[PDB]
Amino acid sequence: APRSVDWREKGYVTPVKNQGQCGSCWAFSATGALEGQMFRKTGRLISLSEQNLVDCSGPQGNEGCNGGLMDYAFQYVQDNGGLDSEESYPYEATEESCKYNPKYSVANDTGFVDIPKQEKALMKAVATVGPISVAIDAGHESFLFYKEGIYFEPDCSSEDMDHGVLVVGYGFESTNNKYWLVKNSWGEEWGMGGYVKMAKDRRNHCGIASAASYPTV
Numbered sequence: 001a002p003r004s005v006d007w008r009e010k011g012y013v014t015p016v017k018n019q020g021q022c023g024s025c026w027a028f029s030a031t032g033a034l035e036g037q038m039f040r041k042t043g044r045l046i047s048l049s050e051q052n053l054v055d056c057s058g059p060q061g062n063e064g065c066n067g068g069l070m071d072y073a074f075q076y077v078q079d080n081g082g083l084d085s086e087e088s089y090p091y092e093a094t095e096e097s098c099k100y101n102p103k104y105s106v107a108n109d110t111g112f113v114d115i116p117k118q119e120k121a122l123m124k125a126v127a128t129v130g131p132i133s134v135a136i137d138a139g140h141e142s143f144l145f146y147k148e149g150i151y152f153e154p155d156c157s158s159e160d161m162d163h164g165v166l167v168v169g170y171g172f173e174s175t176n177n178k179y180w181l182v183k184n185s186w187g188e189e190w191g192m193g194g195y196v197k198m199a200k201d202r203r204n205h206c207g208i209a210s211a212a213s214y215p216t217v
């Protein structure tokens with residue numbers, strides 16, 4: 001694979017969003033990945049509706065503002081035959097009745113791919129596909145209060161993940177210096193404009209390769 005990848009530089013990635021006081025991280029991870037794959041396919045970047053996922057993907061197993069899985073979101077989009085745009089179905093950070101309207105659908109998917117649970121495989125996938133949904137262990141004050149540089153938490157778990165985010169690339173600092181470029185959903189005042197550089201090739205730090213996946217389109 002290349003030594004560095006950054007899909008943001010190719011137009012694959014919407015600006016950093018903010019989930020607010022709703023446990024919808026999984027919905028932002030899933031819209032991020034689908035935004036990327038729709039861009040790959042069509043050349044058009046259109047921001048997608050997390051609220052549509054929050055309100056409507058219960059049947060697939062998601063739990064609204066209480067949590068969910070990116071693969072269940074990808075399944076919803078396939079089952080449903082569409083997903084509305086962010087503009088048409090804006091984000092409210094609370095649960096409400098499903099208001100999906102097929103007239104405003106701007107995305108589709110045909111399923112999803114679960115990546116092997118190794119960082120080499122995750123790198124392969126990022127290098128070829130685009131941005132990738134990942135699970136991480138973000139349950140640490142060091143993460144909540146992260147500002148700069150490559151994030152490494154000695155007490156991170158590779159099994160107990162609690163937050164869905166989006167890998168948009170990877171690289172290295174200087175010339176234990178590799179990182180994953182990770183888009184969060186906590187607004188642009190957290191981290192590096194809303195991004196974190198997660199330690200890469202340090203034995204699956206924080207579980208970043210433990211539940212990685214993307215939608216097929």
Ligand SMILES: *C(=N)C1(NC(=O)[C@@H]2C[C@@H](S(=O)(=O)c3ccccc3Cl)CN2C(=O)C2(c3ccc(F)cc3)CC2)CC1
Binds near residue numbers: 026063
């Ligand atoms: C986001 N605001 C919150 N976190 C979750 O909803 C996370 C997202 C996924 S994950 O990325 O952690 C994960 C973990 C293991 C395997 C696959 C994935 Cl995609 C699930 N989340 C959770 O916190 C858990 C969960 C699992 C199943 C479920 F139905 C609801 C939650 C505990 C793993 C809401 C804080």
